[PDB]
Amino acid sequence: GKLVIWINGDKGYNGLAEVGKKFEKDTGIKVTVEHPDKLEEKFPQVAATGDGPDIIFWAHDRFGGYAQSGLLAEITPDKAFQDKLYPFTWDAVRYNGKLIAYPIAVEALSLIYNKDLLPNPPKTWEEIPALDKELKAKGKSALMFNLQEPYFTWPLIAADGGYAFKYENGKYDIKDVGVDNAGAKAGLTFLVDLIKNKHMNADTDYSIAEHAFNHGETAMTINGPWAWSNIDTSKVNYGVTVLPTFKGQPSKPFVGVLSAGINAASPNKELAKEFLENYLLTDEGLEAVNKDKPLGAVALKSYEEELAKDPRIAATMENAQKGEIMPNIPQMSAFWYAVRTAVINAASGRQTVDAALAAAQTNAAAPGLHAIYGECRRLYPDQPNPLQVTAIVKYDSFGPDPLDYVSMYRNVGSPSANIPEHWHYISFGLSDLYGDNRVHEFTGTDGPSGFGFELTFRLKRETGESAPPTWPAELMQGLARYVFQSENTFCSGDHVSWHSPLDNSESRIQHMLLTEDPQMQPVQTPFGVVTFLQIVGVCTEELHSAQQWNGQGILELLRTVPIAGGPWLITDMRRGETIFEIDPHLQERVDKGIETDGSNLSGVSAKCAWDDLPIRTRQLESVHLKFNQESGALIPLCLRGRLLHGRHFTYKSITGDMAITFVSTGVEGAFATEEHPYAAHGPWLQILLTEEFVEKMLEDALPKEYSWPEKKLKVSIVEHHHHHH
Amino acid sequence: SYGHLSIG
Ligand SMILES: OC[C@H]1O[C@H](O[C@H]2[C@H](O)[C@@H](O)[C@@H](O)O[C@@H]2CO)[C@H](O)[C@@H](O)[C@@H]1O
Ligand SMILES: [Zn+2]
């Protein structure tokens, strides 16, 4: 068959390609080495569909995740082979008692310094600001390193007592995260202080720092072994040394073990095993890769002995020694995303240190949030850190806002599809983000996460708009408040009467329909499934049309009209006409729908009640029903629209636990007999009505009173539910 | 298939 290998772009992929060529020479099987961007993200996406590589290279910390997802084949090396490598490297690639990857090399960050610009590098971080002054005097800077990846800033954060997950009982505690403790705040504050005092730039990334150092523009940098090759080429006289201490304590870099995993879906596990065990993991192969880009302290003893002499490796291992090996537990990716954002926002000043690290601390231990974010990353790779509306006080502590975050993305749309540019709002909170019963009942992997959905919204972008408006977030908060108060889940096709302009302007868009988000795909989390329901602004007439007929139809009609939505159903608040005013004929089709199929509405949430002329199962001779005007206007719909078709109709009260199910003859599951029309299991009431009684009823200013020998009906004009416990 | 009225 074939061999496809994925390895990160900063690693020695050409040497590996040479090893693959030797494998091809000897075996005849071709080896394709690729280095796609963000491979650690793509692999778990693609591997499930079976279009992943045969081998995947990365630090061990990802592999436990993959392994948990069944994406990695168990490796089966004999003892003889295991003897060649260090036990701790094996430990690093061990997950739930199974080996999920082959260890290649030990990696740790070091202080790299220019000997000519700086013969005596600082032992402490506190020295650097002063040093930067001296260097700036002669047009140079002290320190530049990658600030876009938390990997590089972590050693400083970890120094005074920051940690990822607390290691306890031979295990990691997923509830005890150490990112918002004093040491972390101190370290990150110091970093931010370096930036504030203009000793570093917040936007500094890998290539910038590398350039700066290799061109002798900065005296120091922070990087791993792989970086040396380019420095060697730069002919800069450099030294690799121990990282600076902070508050008298050593920087504690996360030690990573470069490892090779085998795709669970690969049919060439044997080819892979052969290649990995008998070609790569040898002195000559590893030397070749190391020749290309230094691996650091390799896991292979025989080659380890040969390379340990190098003081660079010695330094790597000193720093490694002062640090801790990374956990490989599945939650690490959540940890890294969380800390990545905090460092970025803290450095950019978008957030304070405390706010950022509090947010990271909470978010790392939040799988549902992480899962939704994943889908968002897939949809918008270009916007890693979007602007977010965040509730100051979270709902679990009874802040007013049930949505913890609302993400706002810029969606460029498609000019060819004639779908205009717009803002994409995505809510976080209606689903189970945390799973610790702070807000939602924990239901497990099967069933809905929280209410089982999140809200989305697509708002027409103005050309003059630099940033997305925030009012749709409040709109969503309103919607969410309703959902939590009423316990009513939203589904695609439902309608929502708002009776107010959504942006509270003079807009005619006073109502909403709900549909499936056109891009956001449903997601599986350890706490359940999350679907994404998009909000679509509509006019009162269109709502009435959706009520009288069905949501889906009106939605499609709205799709066929670009200015009212188009295929992706974008909302335009400055829209002045209904679709019926824009295209008269369309009206004809609603009227076409109602006449042939009737109404789609299984039931509705409204102000209503029933009573006698609470607890227990009861049959009743007489009944007294109560409605508001709004729900009352649907009674004609309830009767003709559904009862005539052997269908049921249900009114639920939002205020109470009250419910009324209208039933016709010929329905199934009904306990209502023709002899005993009215019966209730409690607040839930069913009444069976005959078409006969239906027509007379249909034929027959508040209060407006309707009466019969068996029943009385009025139309007229206390309790609060909290959370999803 | 379901309606929610005057939620706001
Ligand atoms: O920054 C988050 C990132 O940290 C580690 O990534 C390292 C990687 O281990 C090194 O081989 C080298 O490429 O630098 C990377 C940082 O850009 C973790 O391995 C990774 O899971 C995590 O996302
Ligand atoms: Zn509660």
Author numbering:
A (entry chain C): 6 to 618, 625 to 711, 719 to 735, 746 to 753
B (entry chain G): 120 to 127
Paper text:
SUFU is an essential intracellular negative regulator of mammalian Hedgehog signalling and acts by binding and modulating the activity of GLI transcription factors. Hedgehog signalling plays a fundamental role in the control of metazoan development, cell proliferation and differentiation, as highlighted by the fact that its deregulation is associated with the development of many human tumours. Here, the crystal and small-angle X-ray scattering structures of full-length human SUFU and its complex with the key SYGHL motif conserved in all GLIs are reported. It is demonstrated that GLI binding is associated with major conformational changes in SUFU, including an intrinsically disordered loop that is also crucial for pathway activation.
In order to determine how SUFU interacts with GLI transcription factors, we attempted to co-crystallize MBP-SUFU-FL and MBP-SUFU-Δ with GLI1p as well as corresponding peptides from human GLI2 (GLI2p; residues 267–283) and GLI3 (GLI3p; residues 328–344). Despite extensive screening, these attempts were unsuccessful. Therefore, the residues WLG61–63 of SUFU were mutated to DSF in MBP-SUFU-Δ to disrupt crystal contacts between a loop within the SUFU N-terminal domain and residues in the C-terminal domain previously implicated in GLI binding. Furthermore, another flexible loop in SUFU was shortened and residues 216 and 220 in the MBP moiety were mutated to histidine in order to promote metal ion-mediated crystallization of the fusion protein. Peptide modelled into this density forms a β-strand clamped between the two domains, creating one continuous 13-strand β-sheet spanning both domains. HDX protection analysis and SAXS experiments confirmed that this protein/peptide conformation occurs in solution and is not a crystallization artifact. Upon GLI binding, SUFU undergoes a large conformational change in which the N- and C-terminal domains come together to clamp highly conserved GLI residues in the middle of a large β-sheet. In contrast, the structures of our SUFU–GLI peptide complexes show that both the N- and C-terminal halves of SUFU interact simultaneously with a major evolutionarily conserved SUFU-binding motif, including the amino acids SYGH, within the N-­terminal half of GLI. Moreover, the tight packing of the leucine next to the histidine in GLI with SUFU residues, coupled with the importance of this leucine in the protection of SUFU from deuteration, strongly suggest that the minimal SUFU binding motif in GLI encompasses the amino acids SYGHL. The mutation of Tyr147, Asp159 or Glu376 in MBP-SUFU-FL abolished detectable binding to GLI1p in the microscale thermophoresis assay (data not shown).
